């Protein structure tokens, strides 16, 4: 099952909702992530160029897909097939961002 993250549109995109699969994939409970920017999923082996592409796309409210190395709450790495899109009203205003996370690590 794929995770879903919903964030606020503005001011560093704090998480406002995660689905159950997000907790299965990442090991974080909703309590532990609400109000935070999702960058806490990254760590030392995360590719900086990938993070830069995400940062520029989100600032521009442009959809983006990347494979990015992320980390579970207890530090276990996983590859995240990540897709982020703005949610817009019909006037084009960004209401939120939605991200889908698929664990594409062969853990076992």
Residues that bind ligand FMN (CB under 6 A): 5, 7, 13, 37-39, 41-42, 51, 54-55, 58, 68, 70, 80, 82, 84, 97-99, 101
- From residue 58, give the alpha-carbon distance in Å to each of 20, 29, 30, 84, 95: 24, 24, 22, 8, 13
- 97 pairs with which residues across the strands? 7, 86
The smaller minimum CB distance to its own copies, of residues 74 and 89, is found at: 89
Contacted entry of its own copies, ligand FMN, none for residue 84, CB cut-off 5 to 8 Å set by kind: ligand FMN
The smaller minimum CB distance to its own copies, of residues 22 and 71, is found at: 22
Distance CA 45, CA 16 (A): 27
């Amino acid at each position: 099952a794929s995770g879903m993250i919903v964030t606020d549109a503005g001011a560093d995109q704090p998480i406002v909702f995660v689905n159950r699969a997000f907790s299965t994939i990442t090991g974080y409970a909703p309590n532990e992530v609400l109000g935070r920017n999702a960058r806490f999923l990254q760590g030392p082996q995360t590719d900086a160029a990938t993070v830069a592409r995400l940062r520029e796309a989100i600032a521009a409210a442009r959809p983006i897909q990347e494979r990015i190395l992320n980390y579970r709450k207890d530090g276990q790495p996983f590859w995240n097939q990540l897709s982020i899109s703005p949610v817009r009203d019909e006037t084009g205003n960004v209401v939120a961002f939605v991200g889908v996370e698929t664990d594409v690590t062969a853990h076992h």
